[PDB]
């Protein structure tokens, strides 16, 4: 009966994440014109979180009953999930790089920090996320396990290599490179500043949310009795990760003063 409890939890996440992201977008688009470069990345991060938010109801209706939406929806929902993951993971790296460039290279910062750079980098990030997601979708489809429908990805013994390729692609692209960029930037920023906390907290949260998922995926790729606890681990890690979209608006409303100035009014 755990599926019902998981569905209720997904509904809770849906409601809170939708409210938070809607409020963030509302403030950014009504009480400001995104004049600052910092605001464009926040807007794109909120638009990425909404992609996670939109995939919850299908999962809730899948835990109860079964998958009745067909194959096109089976591909599209997974596309939403993976594009959201990749885009939200890259935008944090962009924020970290921007903060480093300001704190350390302030003299040269004035030239780069313009609206055009933000727009171009955001478009590039979105295209990169979509391209990185394309390989996964081609294998998702609907299957009938004796009359019960399910949306899942199936590989033959010939195409099985792409499963390993995609697992390692996810790992290296979405964890190591972002983590390395954070490591390089924030040691220097702390060195300069100790003698801001917002983006540091953002990265640590968004890394601890996804690191168990990446670790379990790494173990799964290496494997390809351990199966049962590995399946339980990946299942729990999915929920562990899901909360990043809900908490990002929480962080931005808690820390940023600009958010408070326009949230207290409403």
């Amino acid at each position, epitope marked *: 009966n755990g599926k019902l409890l998981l569905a209720v939890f997904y509904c809770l996440l849906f409601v809170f994440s939708l409210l938070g992201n809607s409020l963030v977008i509302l403030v950014l688009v009504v009480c400001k014109k995104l004049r600052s470069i910092t605001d464009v990345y926040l807007l794109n991060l909120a638009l990425s979180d909404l992609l996670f938010v939109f995939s919850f109801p299908f999962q809730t209706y899948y835990l109860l009953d079964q998958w*009745v939406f*067909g*194959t096109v929806m089976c591909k599209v929902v997974s596309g939403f999930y993976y594009i959201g993951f990749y885009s939200s993971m890259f935008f944090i790296t962009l924020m970290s790089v921007d903060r480093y460039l300001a704190v350390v290279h302030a003299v040269y910062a004035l030239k780069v920090r313009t609206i055009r750079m933000g727009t171009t980098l955001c478009l590039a990030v979105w295209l990169t996320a979509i391209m990185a997601t394309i390989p996964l979708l081609v294998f998702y*489809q*609907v*299957a*009938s*396990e*004796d*009359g*019960v*429908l399910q949306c899942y990805s*199936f590989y*033959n*013994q010939q195409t099985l290599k792409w499963k390993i390729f995609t697992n390692f692609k996810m790992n290296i692209l979405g964890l190591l490179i972002p983590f390395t960029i954070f490591m390089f930037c924030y040691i220097k920023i702390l060195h300069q500043l100790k003698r801001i906390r917002l983006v540091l907290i953002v990265v640590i949260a968004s890394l601890l949310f996804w690191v168990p998922f990446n670790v379990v995926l790494f173990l799964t790729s290496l494997h390809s009795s351990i199966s049962q606890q590995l399946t339980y681990a990946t299942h729990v890690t999915e929920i562990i990760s899901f909360t990043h979209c809900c908490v990002n608006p929480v962080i931005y409303a808690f820390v940023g003063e600009k958010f408070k100035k326009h949230l207290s009014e409403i």
Partner: antibody, heavy 121, light 111 residues
Framework: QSVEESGGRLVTPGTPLTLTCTVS????????MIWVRQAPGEGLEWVGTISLGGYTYYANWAKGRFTISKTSTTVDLKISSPTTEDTATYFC??????????????????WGPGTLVTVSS | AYDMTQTPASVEVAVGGTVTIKCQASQSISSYLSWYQQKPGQRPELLIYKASTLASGVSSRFKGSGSGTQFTLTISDLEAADAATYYCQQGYTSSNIDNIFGGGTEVVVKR
């Protein structure tokens, strides 16, 4: 669960034919449907398959001569231009395990009482 | 591509004997073979799917084994009602396929 075939007839060589397979007890959106043919005194010969979403797959010899369609309750197999070698008993089966792309589509149960088609002048 | 060949075309066996029927695929299939039985003048009936698991309602005298390329079906305690034709069917793929069924093996009960 039950499947019943209809449409067996004596048809001159060249005029199109159409057979129907009516279903009772289960929904077609959940299972795939298989068409098979057996010549008198010979082994089974798969002709075509229709999956959950309505994607048709045909045997190499059957590409271009047969067409399968589905509806809420019935599954139709149309023979565009039968020849004298198309005389046989046609069976309609349900695949219990199947995939939308027709991989892993092994277990066929239940079968139907085949319908006999004859072509001659 | 995947050509299914059944080795014995016809096997004669006495009642209370063991019957072995062999099926083979040109290319490896990861244990996705099903077995069907057809008595004369009747529709086929499923016996085994996934090459090992019995279909509900079928006796325990039928045992399927094998994986990869070779496959086998064994009838342990033959009865006079077991005279029929058995077909092996591969559920691996349906693209560029001439026929998913085998040639069919006929069991004739000795007397």
């Amino acid at each position: 669960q039950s499947v019943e075939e209809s449409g067996g007839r004596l048809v001159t060589p060249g005029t199109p034919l159409t057979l129907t397979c009516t279903v009772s007890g289960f929904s077609l959106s959940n299972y795939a449907m298989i068409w098979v043919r057996q010549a008198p005194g010979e082994g089974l010969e798969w002709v075509g398959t229709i999956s959950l979403g309505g994607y048709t797959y045909y045997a190499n010899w059957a590409k271009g001569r047969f067409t399968i369609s589905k509806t809420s309750t019935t599954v139709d197999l149309k023979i565009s231009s039968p020849t004298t070698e198309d005389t046989a008993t046609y069976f309609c089966a349900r695949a219990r395990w199947s995939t939308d792309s027709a991989i892993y589509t092994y277990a066929f149960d239940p079968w139907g009482p085949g319908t006999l088609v004859t072509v001659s002048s | 591509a995947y050509d299914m060949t059944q080795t014995p075309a016809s096997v004669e066996v006495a009642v209370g004997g063991t019957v072995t029927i062999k099926c083979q695929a040109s290319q490896s299939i990861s244990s996705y073979l099903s077995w069907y039985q057809q008595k004369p003048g009747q529709r086929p009936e499923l016996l085994i799917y996934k090459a090992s698991t019995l279909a509900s309602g079928v006796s325990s005298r039928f045992k399927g084994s094998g994986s990869g390329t070779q496959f086998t079906l064994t009838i342990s305690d033959l009865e006079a009602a077991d005279a029929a034709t058995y077909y092996c069917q591969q559920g691996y793929t349906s693209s560029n396929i001439d026929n998913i069924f085998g040639g069919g093996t006929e069991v004739v009960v000795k007397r």
